[PDB]
Amino acid sequence: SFVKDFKPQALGDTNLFKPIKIGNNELLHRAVIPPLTRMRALHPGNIPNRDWAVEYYTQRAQRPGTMIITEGAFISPQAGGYDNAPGVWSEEQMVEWTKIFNAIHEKKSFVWVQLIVLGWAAFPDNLARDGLRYDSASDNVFMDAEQEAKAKKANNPQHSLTKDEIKQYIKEYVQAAKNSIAAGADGVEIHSANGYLLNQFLDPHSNTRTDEYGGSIENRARFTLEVVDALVEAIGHEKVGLRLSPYGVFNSMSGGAETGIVAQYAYVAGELEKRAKAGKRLAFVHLVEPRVTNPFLTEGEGEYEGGSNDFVYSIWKGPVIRAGNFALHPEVVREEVKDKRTLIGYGRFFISNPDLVDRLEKGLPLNKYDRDTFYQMSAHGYIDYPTYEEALKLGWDKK
Amino acid sequence: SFVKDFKPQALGDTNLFKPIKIGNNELLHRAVIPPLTRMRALHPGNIPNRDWAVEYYTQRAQRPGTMIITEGAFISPQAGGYDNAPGVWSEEQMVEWTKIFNAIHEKKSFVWVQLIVLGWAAFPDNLARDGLRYDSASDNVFMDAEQEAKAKKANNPQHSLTKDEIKQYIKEYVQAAKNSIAAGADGVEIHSANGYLLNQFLDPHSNTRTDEYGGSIENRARFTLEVVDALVEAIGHEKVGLRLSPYGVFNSMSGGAETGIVAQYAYVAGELEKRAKAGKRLAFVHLVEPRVTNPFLTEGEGEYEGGSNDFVYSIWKGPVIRAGNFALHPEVVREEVKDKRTLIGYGRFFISNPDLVDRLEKGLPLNKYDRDTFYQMSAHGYIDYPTYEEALKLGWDKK
Ligand SMILES: Cc1cc2nc3c(=O)[nH]c(=O)nc-3n(C[C@H](O)[C@H](O)[C@H](O)COP(=O)(O)O)c2cc1C
Ligand SMILES: Cc1cc2nc3c(=O)[nH]c(=O)nc-3n(C[C@H](O)[C@H](O)[C@H](O)COP(=O)(O)O)c2cc1C
Ligand SMILES: O=C1CCC=C1CO
Ligand SMILES: O=C1CCC=C1CO
Ligand SMILES: [Mg+2]
Ligand SMILES: [Mg+2]
Ligand SMILES: [Mg+2]
Ligand SMILES: [Mg+2]
């Protein structure tokens, strides 16, 4: 059914519908699909879903010139720990990704692979089963009591990475980025948000290290910036973006409660601008808004009102993608896109509306999403959400 | 005469005219006199002007409940280097300051002493004459070629402070703050802006140190925060404010050209909020706006459009005073004061309008200022600017 208490607004008269170039890609509008883990990849081997993934992405690529960022993809077995999220390290995986990229390109849209490394968000028992470590920045602070306990039970207690192990992850990021481009992707997004491994290094709660990778703003940003630099060198700055969530608390990050949090992220933004001024400007910075500090809370919940991402614009001078509770708030989007280098990521409502872009342009009702099928091994709630035309045929205008 | 091309706006219907408490002081409105060096102090001894200073401050205290921040005052001979700026280290000086504070209090207004230390902005020949060093953070970068050359000619080449010498300055800050309070001041403002000594430490252009006082964000902020902590301990957090100019370029600071500049100031703001949450909240943070990156350029010149101070509000949660080209822009003030913890500093137009607050409330014409007498040894252009009533009697409505 359609969202009941929503008053749509046509956004066709705003910059949301002005073309913009991101990296090598000529976008025809500025509604971006942010990375959305859906858990349809198959075990063993973390293989993108052989039955449904092409169709899922094809549907959501339907508006020409749409930028799509993939669900997070593991750079290596050690980077993983969810059996039904995909990877980008193996031939088996890349065969499926190539089909997905080809399908998106046939719709005249674009695709950027998000590269993820779980750190303490991984399931330690899955990792133990596969003979893998349970990794984080530190070994004396944990995501939660359940994760700590699971790790101990699995004889796999949380491990603080050595410098050599950090370097090994960097090698895997590089190879994953190369794999992605070779298979046809337009670029990659480095995930440094949402409390995954890179964020675990950025955040002083999760990073209690006393070596060069912790203990100061510059040290906490070191790993993230090393990944940025390694990927820029490997595949070019025009094929690399970075995702950050300054005010996020998901996966036990600090958010605004940490008085030093803005400084930590301002430093990262500054270092990206320094690289840009030196001739290597990333394609984009992607920010999760304080509008959504935890994406598994219903829209309007977990909204942090004590901080703004606006500071990033004083520092980084390139494109900025912003995501978080924008679908239900066209009045906010109308104001944000007045800035000519701002794009808007729509997550949950792109799950439920394959034709979201048309709906945004024309001010149409939105399909309600079904949270129960966000992570299911099913075509249901994945590829069977209707377009607006299909919804009318189903009588949703009268439900 | 009155400013010709100015269209005044009555601001009485805005928060500019709502009372607010700053430290121990119940302000009746939010128009603040920022620190304004006027060079009427007499040599020898850096003595506040025995003839005119009481009258100058009395005039500008005339609106009950006005917060006045004094012209910068040297904490010690070594902190100085301008013969006609006042100090707060000697009995002779404090005798005059006491008269000034008493006069301001008789008008039911308030007075905060700005404490300044010049560093590389000092005149090295004055310092040499008096047997004093020419100090800065570093010894291999200079304010400009003329200052470097003057220092060498005076056999007083710029000196990078030792840790012991930093500690000595801290002792002098503490004693200067004590002197100020004992003489009747309501509080002190620590000047860490405008390219003076503390700013010389904050800024990576002027601070090339490799010890604990340079080489990182935390290290560059160390001296400023040590002064904050020493003064909070000595006279209490409710009697201490801090002035910063993140985007300033005056006295050869970096401004927005330094990609790390926002992070540097965000760190300072975060450290103040951390102290506040731990029970020691400074009375205020005072920011110079990017509207004025150099206060000796005419209003509208040297305006940096690539940055905003708004980031500070995401971090520091106490009162914020903002200064820079606000007198000629009531339309901007009207928007800024919608934030309920924002005060507005009016500098140059408080020089020329002793009754500025009345003029702001009622939307009256403003007296033009005379830049030639900003730094003169004269009552002219100091205490002879008329109130609005006096200006009408002089026929300024018809000039
Ligand atoms: C089911 C689901 C899966 C997500 N997967 C990812 C992911 O793989 N990587 C990532 O960076 N963010 C992920 N997110 C966060 C979203 O990209 C987005 O920032 C968030 O949902 C807020 O935007 P929205 O209000 O438009 O949904 C996910 C969110 C949801 C609800
Ligand atoms: C003549 C003059 C003297 C000043 N003296 C000081 C000073 O002693 N300390 C300080 O922090 N700022 C000083 N400033 C900067 C002002 O406080 C203020 O930030 C600046 O003039 C911008 O505000 P405005 O546009 O309202 O004048 C001075 C400015 C002027 C023009
Ligand atoms: O980043 C996020 C938010 C929810 C899932 C991921 C990656 O697996
Ligand atoms: O801070 C400033 C700006 C002009 C003079 C000072 C202090 O002497
Ligand atoms: Mg151990
Ligand atoms: Mg169901
Ligand atoms: Mg020397
Ligand atoms: Mg003259």
Curated annotation (Swiss-Prot), chains A, B:
Binding site for substrate: H191, N194, Y375
Keywords, alphabetical: Flavoprotein, FMN, NADP, Oxidoreductase
InterPro entries noted in UniProt: Aldolase_TIM (IPR013785), OxRdtase_FMN_N (IPR001155), Oye-like (IPR045247)
Entry keyword annotation includes Oxidoreductase: yes
Residues at the active site: Y196 (proton donor)
Catalytic activity reported: A + NADPH + H(+) = AH2 + NADP(+)
MF (Gene Ontology): FMN binding; NADPH dehydrogenase activity
EC number per UniProt: 1.6.99.1
Binding residue positions for FMN: T37, Q114, R243, R348
Listed result of changing Q114N: Strong reduction of substrate binding
Cofactor(s) listed: FMN
A Pfam family the protein falls into: Oxidored_FMN
The keyword Repressor appears for this protein: no
CDD domains in the record: OYE_like_FMN
Top-level taxon of origin: Eukaryota
Function noted in UniProt: Flavin-dependent enoate reductase that catalyzes the chemo- and stereoslective hydrogenation of electron-poor alkenes. The enzyme is reduced by NADPH, and oxygen, quinones, and alpha,beta-unsaturated aldehydes and ketones can act as electron acceptors to complete catalytic turnover. The physiological oxidant remains elusive.
Quaternary structure note: Homodimer or heterodimer.
Family membership noted in the UniProt record: Belongs to the NADH:flavin oxidoreductase/NADH oxidase family.
Name of the protein described by the UniProt record: NADPH dehydrogenase 1
The species this protein was found in: Saccharomyces pastorianus
Lineage: Eukaryota, Fungi, Dikarya, Ascomycota, Saccharomycotina
